[PDB]
C-alpha cells in the first residue's frame, strides 16, 4: 500500500538477482527480507538459502587446450595471473572463490575496491588474484560497459593494469600454440601466466583458452624464500636449477611432495606449475621438520618466530625507531591518525597483529590456557589442555609467548597514558 514496502521488495529482488557473488551479510539481509515478505503478503515465491555456494565457472565456457578458429569480431586479449582468485561483489572486503570466507585487505586496495569498483553498475565483480603479496586484477564480468573502459578507469586511478591487446582482423584466424607464444612474448609480463581470455562485443560469457605441455620430468627438493616483513614462501627446486611455481602452502600440502620423486608438473613457455589435483594430516608436520623448528604456517604463507619489541610496534604503526616511552607517547599524540587507529582498535587485537599470529589458532591456544592478571597486566600463564599441542605451528607460536606478553604489557601501559 505504502512506498516503503515497495522499495523493500524492489531491493529484495535486486539483491536476489545478484546471489552467486555475495557474503554472509547479503545472505542474512536476503533472509530477513524473505521473512518479512512472506509474513506481510502471506506467500513469497522464493525461500531462504543457507548454502552460500560461490560459483563463477558458470560465467565462463570450458577450458580450451586445442587449436581452434576464432569468430569474426573485435578482440581484446588479456592474460590471467596464476593464483587464487578473490571475487568481490560490493561494499565489503574481497571474498575467496570457492570458500565463501572473506579475506582482510589493506586499506589502500580497500579504497580502490570502494572507488573504482562498478563505475556505475556495469561490472558484477572484479576478479582479484593475490600472488606473493601482490593484489592484481584480471578479466571481470561486464554487462553494460566494456572491460576496456574499466581498465581505463583503473589506470587513471593508478591501479596495476595487465597488458591488453586490440585485434580486429579475422581472416579465419586459427589460434595455435605458436600464436599464443608470440602473444605472450609481446605482452612481456615477467609475472607468471596460466591462461588468457579475450573480450568480444555482444557475447556476455567469456572464453578462456590456455596452451601448455605436460612434460613429466622430475622434482628434487624444497626451499624457503623471503618476500617481505616476516613473509616466507615454499618453492620447489629441481636438478636443472629453476623453481616451479607454488600458489600457496595448500598447493604443497595437496601435492604432498616429500623427497626427490616423480610428480606431475606442467611446463609452459616461461614457467612451470605444479599439479592441481591429488600422510594426509602429517604432511605439514613433515614439512616443518624438514624446513626448521623455528617456523609456522599462517594463512596463505609461512612465518618465523623472532624477537618482538619496540621495533615491531613501530613498524606496524608506521613510525620511526623509538627508545623511551615518553618520546613514544609524544609521537603517538603528535599524529591524529595513529592515535585514532589505536583508539579504534583493542589492545589484544593490535598486540596479536604486531607479532603476525594466526587469527583462529592463537584464539584456540589462548582458550586452551590459563592466565593470572594483576593491574590489567598479564605476568604468568600456563597450558591446561595439552592435547591441543599437536600442531607444530601452535607450539612455535607458544614459543614466543614471553615476547607476546611483553608486547601486551607495553601496549597496555602506553594506552593507559594515552587514555
Amino acid at each position: 500500500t505504502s512506498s516503503a514496502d515497495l522499495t523493500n521488495l524492489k531491493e529484495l529482488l535486486s539483491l536476489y538477482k545478484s546471489l552467486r557473488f555475495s557474503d554472509s551479510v547479503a545472505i542474512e539481509k536476503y533472509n530477513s527480507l524473505v521473512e518479512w515478505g512472506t509474513s506481510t503478503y502471506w506467500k513469497i515465491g522464493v525461500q531462504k538459502v543457507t548454502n552460500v555456494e560461490t560459483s563463477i565457472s558458470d560465467y565462463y565456457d570450458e577450458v580450451k587446450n586445442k587449436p581452434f578458429n576464432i569468430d569474426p569480431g573485435y578482440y581484446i586479449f588479456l592474460p590471467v595471473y596464476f593464483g587464487s582468485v578473490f571475487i568481490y561483489s560490493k561494499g565489503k572486503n574481497m571474498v575467496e572463490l570457492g570458500s565463501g570466507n572473506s579475506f582482510q585487505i589493506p586499506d589502500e586496495i580497500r579504497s580502490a575496491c570502494n572507488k573504482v569498483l562498478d563505475s556505475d553498475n556495469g561490472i558484477d565483480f572484479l576478479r582479484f588474484v593475490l600472488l606473493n603479496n601482490r593484489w592484481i586484477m584480471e578479466d571481470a564480468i561486464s554487462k553494460y560497459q566494456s572491460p576496456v573502459n574499466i581498465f581505463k578507469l583503473a589506470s587513471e586511478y593508478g591501479l596495476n593494469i595487465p597488458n591488453y591487446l586490440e585485434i580486429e582482423i579475422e581472416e579465419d584466424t586459427l589460434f595455435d600454440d605458436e600464436l599464443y607464444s608470440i602473444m605472450e612474448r609481446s605482452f612481456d609480463d615477467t609475472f607468471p601466466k596460466i591462461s588468457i581470455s579475450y573480450i568480444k562485443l555482444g557475447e556476455l560469457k567469456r572464453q578462456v583458452v590456455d596452451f601448455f605441455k605436460f612434460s613429466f620430468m622430475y622434482i628434487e627438493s624444497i626451499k624457503v624464500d623471503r618476500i617481505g616483513d616476516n613473509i616466507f614462501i615454499p618453492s620447489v627446486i629441481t636438478k636443472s636449477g629453476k623453481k616451479i611455481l607454488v600458489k600457496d602452502v595448500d598447493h604443497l600440502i595437496r601435492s604432498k611432495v616429500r623427497e626427490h620423486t616423480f610428480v606431475k608438473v606442467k611446463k609452459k613457455n616461461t614457467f612451470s606449475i605444479l599439479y592441481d589435483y591429488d600422510t594426509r594430516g602429517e604432511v605439514i608436520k613433515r614439512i616443518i621438520d624438514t624446513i626448521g623448528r623455528d617456523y609456522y604456517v599462517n594463512g596463505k604463507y609461512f612465518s618465523k618466530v623472532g624477537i618482538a619489541g619496540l621495533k615491531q610496534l613501530t613498524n606496524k604503526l608506521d613510525i620511526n625507531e623509538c627508545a623511551t616511552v615518553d618520546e613514544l607517547v609524544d609521537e603517538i599524540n603528535k599524529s591524529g591518525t595513529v592515535k585514532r587507529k589505536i583508539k579504534n582498535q583493542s589492545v589484544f587485537d593490535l598486540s596479536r597483529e604486531c607479532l603476525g599470529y594466526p587469527e583462529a589458532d592463537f584464539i584456540t591456544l589462548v582458550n586452551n590456557m590459563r592466565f593470572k592478571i594483576e593491574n590489567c597486566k598479564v605476568v604468568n600463564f600456563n597450558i591446561e589442555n595439552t592435547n591441543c599441542l599437536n600442531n607444530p605451528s601452535i607450539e612455535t607460536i607458544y614459543g614466543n609467548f614471553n615476547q607476546f606478553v611483553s608486547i601486551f604489557n607495553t601496549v597496555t601501559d602506553v594506552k593507559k597514558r594515552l587514555f
Partner: protein, 1005 residues
C-alpha cells in the same frame, strides 16, 4: 444524576462518534450518559507549538522523561549511559485522525486514555451532579466535562439486573439444521426482569402439529396464541406459529437487557433465529443508540486470532454481536473453551465435569434404585448444586457408565432424593453426574408427536436453565467485575484480549504515575537462550516417603529481586578469549559493586564468544517489577478470599481467579522476552532464567544428603548466597524443635525448575509431615533470603518416576494424616494426556497398581514377576483382540484444529479440511475434535505397521462403524506394550516378546 452504578461502556460507530455509559440508580432507573469521542495524542511542547493547525483541545501532562530502551553489546568497560530526555508533554484531543510524526506513547488505546485521563474507573458508582449533565432525552444525559462530573465516589451498592438465558432447538434431517430447509422447533427462555421475577417459558411451533394435537395440548393446559399482542410471560408452555415466535424473539432481543446469555448462540442460535426472521418476513432486529440517533441491524461478525510462532497461521475464531444499546450478549462456549482445559467442550461434557455428587444407596428394586445426597455423603455444597440442577434434569450418569432416567425427584433443604431407573448394583456409595443421555434427536424428530414434543420442550428448558447454572457456577459476573477493575477496560470485552493487551491499562497508569516514556530506535534481534533446569531421576520405584519443596512465584520474584527491566539494564560485557575475560572480570568486580548493581553470567549468545555478563541497576525500581508486584498483590488478596470460602462454588471461583492472576504474572514475564512486544528485553529474560537456575541448584545442593539427629539439623553445604556475599550466618547446623528421638536422612532425587524432591527413610505419614513442616520453616527462615520464599506442597507415597517429567503417586496434603485418603495424582503419564486412549489408561492403571503391590509385599528375587506380567499382558491382549467387545469410545483420541504449520501440506490438515468439505458441520480454527485409527475388518494382525497416520478418521457424535470396518488394535497394542516393558527389568524376555507380534526393536529409556 445522584447515585448511579455503572453496568457497561460502549462506543458509537456513526458519523459523529460518542462514548456512552449505562448505569442504574438505587431505585432501579436506567440512565445513559454521553461524552464526545476524541483521538488522543502525546506530543512535546515544541511539536505542539509547531502544529500549524491548532488542535481542538490540549492538556498539560507535565514534565516527563523519555528513555531509550535499546540494548547494545559492549566488548569493554566503556559503557555509555542511556539517553534520558526530560521535557514538557501535551495530551491533545482531536475529533479526527491526525498524523503527527513525532508522537510518543502510541501503543495505548483511546478508551484507556479517556479512563486514566479523566480518572474514571470502568466499574463503580458515582454521585453525579446536575450542573455538568444536560438532559438530552428522557433518561439520556450529556456531559461535556467527564473529568469534573465523576469527581465524587461512593461505596458500592447492589442493583437489580435483567437476564435472558435463551436456547433454541431446531429440527434437522441428516445431521445438522439449515436455515433454508430446517425450521426451528422449540425456543426456551429464562427471563429475569428488574423486579427479581424469574419466568421460564418454552414456545412450541404449532405448524409441526395437526389440529387434533393442538386440541389435546390446549386441553392439557397449553395456551395457544394467535398474535404477539396477547402473549404473556406467565404460562410455561405457549403454542404459536413460526412468525409469531420470531416476532416474540425479536421483541425480547430488542429490549434493553443487561445480559443475553446463550451457549454457542452467537455462532448458531442468534444467527439461526435472525436468518429465519429475515427469511420468513424480511424484518430486521433494530438496535438503537441511547440518544435515538443511530439504528443498526443485528449481524454476527467474526474475529480471528493469530499465533506468535512459526508461520503464525490461524488458531482462534470467535463470533460477536453488534449493538449500540449497552446490552451484553454472552456466549459461554468461547469462555469455557478459553478458560478451562478439558478433553471435549460439548455441553454434556461440561455439565458432567461440573455437576457431580456422591450418592448413598437408600432402597433397591427390580428395576429402580433410590439414591440420597447431602453434606454427609459428599463435600459441602455439592449436594445443593446437584439438587438445583435436578429441578430441570432428566437423566443421571452413574459410575460414568450407566445412563438412567429420573423417575421421581425430591429437593430437600440439605440435598436431594432422586429415584433412578438403573439395574441393581452392589456396594452402597456411587457417583452421580449430569452428563450424556440415551436419546437420539433425529429419530424422535422423525416421529414428532405430543409426548415427544413435550419431552423435547422439557429438554430445551433444561438447556436454557443449564446456561444459567453454568453462568452461576463459573462466577462470570464476579470475574467480569474484577477484570474490569484491574485491566481498566469496559465490561463488554474483559475476556476478549490476551496478556499483551490486558496489561496496557495498568502499564499506562504506572507510566503516567512515574512520568516515564519508553522508546526504541534500533531493530530488535532475537537470540535463543536456555531455560529451566530439570534433574534426572535417580530411581524408578521408591516405596518410601518423598517430600516436595517448591518456590513461591519464582520468576516474578526473581524479576522483583534483580530489578530486571529493559530500561534498567546497564549493559552486556562479553569476551572472546581468556585474557580479555580475566581483565574485564577484574574491572567489573570493582566498577559495579553488588549492593546496588547485579551481574548475571549467562551463556554466550554467539558461538564466537565464550563469556557474557549482563549488568542491571537495582537503585530505581523498574516498570516490570512494579507491574508484577501489583499482580502478585491482587493474587494474594484473592487467595486470602479463597481461604474464607465454605461452599464448593466459591472455592472453585476463587481458585480459578488466583490461578488467572498467576498466569497473568507469568505471561508478563514471558512478554519481557517476547520480540514483538514493546517491553522486549533479551538480557532481562536471560538473567531471570539464570537466577532461577542458580536458585534451584543451590536449594538442591543444600538439601541433598542432609540428615537430622537429636535437636540439630545438618545441611549439606554452607548457607551462602549464590550471587554476592551477605551479612548472614552460613553455618549448616540449625536448631530443630523436633524431639531428640528423631533420626532420618534426606536424599534429593528429582527437581523441576523450582521444585525439589527429598527422599526420607521413613514411612510414618504424620512424622514425615511434621518433619517436612519443620524443614520448610527452617529453609524459609535461614536458607533463603530477601523476597525468596518456599513452601511444602505434599508428601508422595508409592512414587513411580517413569521419566524426567512423568510420575504417578499418592499425595497427602500438608493438612492431612495417615488415616486421611491419599489423592492419586499423575504428572505427564499416559493418564492425563488427551491423545493416548481410554483402554490404555485402564490397563496401565491396573498393571501399575499390581506392580506396586508386588514391590511393596516384597518381590523381584528373580524374573518370576516379569514372567507373570508378560503372561497377563499376553492373555489380556489376545482376549481383547479376539473378543472385540470394547466399544469405539474406548479407542478415541482428541486433537485441536489450527493452521500454524511450517509445511503447507501437513498430514494433520487435509483431515479436518476434507471433513469440512464433505459434512455440513464445520470444525472451527480452535475446535477440539475426535479421531481414531480404523481399518477394514478383513485384515489380520499386522506385525509391520507401515503407511500409518493415514487410516485415522474424524469421529463425530453421529458415527457408527460398519461390519466392514474395525479398530486398528495393533497401533493401540503397540503403544501399550512398549509402555509396560519399560517398567520391568528383564531385557531379553521383553525384546523377544516384543519382536514376536511387533516387528520392531523396543526403545528403553
Amino acid at each position: 444524576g445522584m447515585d448511579v452504578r455503572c453496568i457497561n461502556w460502549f462506543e458509537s460507530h456513526g458519523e459523529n462518534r460518542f462514548l456512552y455509559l449505562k448505569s442504574r440508580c438505587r431505585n432501579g432507573e436506567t440512565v445513559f450518559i454521553r461524552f464526545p469521542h476524541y483521538f488522543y495524542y502525546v506530543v512535546t511542547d515544541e511539536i505542539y507549538q509547531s502544529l500549524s493547525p491548532p488542535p481542538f483541545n490540549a492538556r498539560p501532562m507535565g514534565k516527563m522523561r523519555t528513555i531509550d530502551i535499546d540494548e547494545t553489546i559492549s566488548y569493554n568497560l566503556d559503557i555509555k549511559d542511556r539517553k534520558c530526555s526530560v521535557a514538557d508533554m501535551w495530551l491533545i484531543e482531536e475529533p479526527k485522525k491526525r498524523s503527527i510524526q513525532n508522537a510518543t506513547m502510541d501503543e495505548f488505546f483511546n478508551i484507556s486514555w479517556f479512563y486514566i485521563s479523566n480518572g474514571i474507573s470502568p466499574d463503580g458508582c458515582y454521585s453525579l451532579d446536575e450542573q455538568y449533565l444536560t438532559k438530552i432525552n428522557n433518561g439520556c444525559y450529556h456531559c461535556d466535562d467527564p473529568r469534573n462530573c465523576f469527581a465524587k465516589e461512593i461505596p458500592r451498592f447492589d442493583i437489580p439486573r435483567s437476564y435472558l438465558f435463551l436456547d433454541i432447538e431446531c429440527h434437522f434431517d441428516k445431521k445438522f439444521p439449515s436455515v433454508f430447509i430446517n425450521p426451528i422447533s422449540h425456543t426456551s427462555y429464562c427471563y429475569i426482569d428488574l423486579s427479581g421475577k424469574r419466568l421460564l417459558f418454552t414456545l412450541i411451533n404449532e405448524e409441526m402439529l395437526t389440529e387434533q394435537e393442538i386440541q389435546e395440548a390446549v386441553d392439557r393446559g397449553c395456551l395457544r396464541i394467535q398474535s404477539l399482542m396477547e402473549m404473556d410471560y406467565e404460562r410455561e408452555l405457549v403454542l404459536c406459529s413460526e412468525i409469531v415466535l420470531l416476532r416474540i424473539a425479536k421483541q425480547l432481543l430488542e429490549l434493553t437487557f443487561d445480559y443475553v446469555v446463550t451457549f454457542n448462540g452467537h455462532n448458531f442460535d442468534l444467527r439461526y433465529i435472525t436468518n429465519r426472521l429475515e427469511l420468513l418476513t424480511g424484518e430486521k432486529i433494530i438496535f438503537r443508540s441511547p440518544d435515538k440517533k443511530e439504528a443498526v441491524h443485528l449481524c454476527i461478525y467474526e474475529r480471528n486470532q493469530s499465533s506468535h510462532k512459526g508461520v503464525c497461521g490461524m488458531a482462534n475464531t470467535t463470533f460477536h454481536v453488534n449493538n449500540n444499546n449497552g446490552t451484553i450478549f454472552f456466549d459461554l462456549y468461547s469462555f469455557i473453551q478459553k478458560s478451562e482445559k478439558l478433553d471435549s467442550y460439548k455441553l454434556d461434557s461440561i455439565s458432567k465435569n461440573a455437576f457431580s455428587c456422591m450418592g448413598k444407596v437408600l432402597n433397591r428394586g427390580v428395576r429402580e434404585m433410590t439414591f440420597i445426597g447431602d453434606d454427609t455423603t459428599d463435600a459441602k455444597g455439592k449436594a445443593d448444586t446437584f439438587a438445583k440442577v435436578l429441578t430441570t434434569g432428566n437423566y443421571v450418569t452413574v459410575d460414568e457408565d450407566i445412563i438412567c432416567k429420573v423417575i421421581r425427584k425430591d429437593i430437600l433443604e440439605n440435598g436431594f432424593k432422586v429415584v433412578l431407573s438403573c439395574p441393581t448394583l452392589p456396594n452402597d456409595i456411587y457417583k452421580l453426574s449430569f452428563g450424556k443421555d440415551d436419546i437420539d434427536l433425529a429419530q424422535m424428530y422423525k416421529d414428532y408427536n405430543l409426548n415427544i414434543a413435550l419431552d423435547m420442550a422439557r429438554y430445551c428448558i433444561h438447556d436454557a436453565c443449564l446456561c444459567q447454572y453454568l453462568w452461576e457456577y463459573y462466577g462470570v459476573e464476579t470475574k467480569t467485575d474484577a477484570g474490569a477493575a484491574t485491566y481498566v477496560l469496559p465490561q463488554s470485552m474483559v475476556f476478549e484480549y490476551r496478556a499483551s493487551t490486558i496489561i496496557k491499562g495498568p502499564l499506562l497508569k504506572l507510566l503516567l504515575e512515574t512520568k516515564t516514556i519508553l522508546v526504541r530506535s534500533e531493530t530488535k534481534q532475537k537470540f535463543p537462550y536456555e531455560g529451566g533446569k530439570v534433574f534426572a531421576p535417580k530411581q524408578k520405584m521408591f516405596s518410601n516417603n518423598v517430600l516436595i519443596f517448591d518456590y513461591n512465584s519464582l520468576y516474578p520474584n526473581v524479576c522483583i529481586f534483580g530489578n530486571l527491566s529493559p530500561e534498567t539494564l546497564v549493559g552486556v560485557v562479553v569476551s572472546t578469549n581468556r585474557l580479555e575475560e580475566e581483565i574485564n572480570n577484574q574491572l567489573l568486580l570493582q566498577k559495579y559493586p553488588p549492593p546496588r548493581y547485579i551481574t548475571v553470567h549467562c551463556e554466550p549468545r554467539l558461538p564466537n564468544l565464550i563469556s557474557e555478563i549482563a549488568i542491571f541497576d537495582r537503585s530505581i525500581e523498574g516498570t516490570i517489577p512494579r507491574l508484577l508486584r501489583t499482580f502478585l498483590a491482587e493474587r494474594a488478596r484473592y487467595k486470602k478470599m479463597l481461604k474464607q470460602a465454605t461452599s464448593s462454588t466459591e472455592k472453585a471461583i476463587y481458585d480459578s481467579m488466583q490461578y488467572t492472576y498467576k498466569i497473568v504474572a507469568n505471561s508478563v514475564y514471558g512478554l519481557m522476552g517476547f520480540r514483538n512486544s514493546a517491553l522486549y528485553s533479551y538480557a532481562s529474560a536471560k538473567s531471570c532464567t539464570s537466577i532461577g537456575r542458580r536458585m534451584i541448584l543451590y536449594l538442591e545442593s543444600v538439601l541433598n544428603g542432609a540428615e537430622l539427629s537429636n535437636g540439630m539439623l545438618r545441611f549439606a553445604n554452607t548457607l551462602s548466597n549464590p550471587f554476592y556475599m551477605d551479612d548472614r550466618d552460613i553455618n549448616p547446623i540449625v536448631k530443630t524443635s523436633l524431639p531428640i528421638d528423631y533420626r532420618f536422612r534426606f536424599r534429593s532425587v528429582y527437581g523441576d525448575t523450582d521444585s525439589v524432591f527429598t527422599e526420607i527413610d521413613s514411612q510414618d505419614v504424620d512424622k514425615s509431615i511434621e518433619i517436612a513442616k519443620e524443614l520448610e520453616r527452617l529453609i524459609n527462615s535461614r536458607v533463603l533470603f530477601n523476597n525468596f520464599k518456599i513452601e511444602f506442597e505434599a508428601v508422595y507415597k508409592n512414587l513411580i518416576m517413569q521419566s524426567k517429567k512423568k510420575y504417578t503417586t499418592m499425595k497427602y496434603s500438608a493438612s492431612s494424616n495417615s488415616k486421611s485418603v491419599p489423592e492419586r495424582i499423575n504428572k505427564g503419564t499416559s493418564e492425563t494426556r488427551r491423545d493416548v486412549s481410554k483402554f490404555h489408561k485402564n490397563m496401565i492403571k491396573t498393571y501399575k497398581t499390581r506392580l506396586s503391590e508386588m514391590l511393596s509385599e516384597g518381590r523381584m528375587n528373580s524374573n518370576q514377576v516379569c514372567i507373570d506380567i508378560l503372561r497377563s499382558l499376553e492373555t489380556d491382549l489376545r482376549s481383547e483382540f479376539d473378543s472385540r467387545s470394547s466399544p469405539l469410545e474406548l479407542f478415541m483420541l482428541s486433537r485441536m484444529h489450527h493452521s500454524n504449520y511450517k509445511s503447507a501440506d501437513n498430514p494433520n490438515m487435509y483431515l479436518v479440511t476434507e471433513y469440512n468439505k464433505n459434512n455440513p458441520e464445520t470444525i472451527e480454527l480452535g475446535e477440539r475434535y475426535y479421531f481414531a485409527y480404523i481399518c477394514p475388518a478383513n485384515v489380520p494382525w499386522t506385525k509391520k505397521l507401515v503407511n500409518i497416520k493415514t487410516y485415522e478418521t474424524i469421529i463425530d457424535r453421529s458415527f457408527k462403524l460398519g461390519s466392514n470396518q474395525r479398530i486398528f488394535y495393533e497401533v493401540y497394542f503397540k503403544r501399550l506394550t512398549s509402555e509396560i516393558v519399560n517398567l520391568l527389568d528383564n531385557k531379553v524376555l521383553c525384546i523377544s516378546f516384543f519382536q514376536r507380534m511387533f516387528g520392531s526393536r523396543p526403545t528403553f529409556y
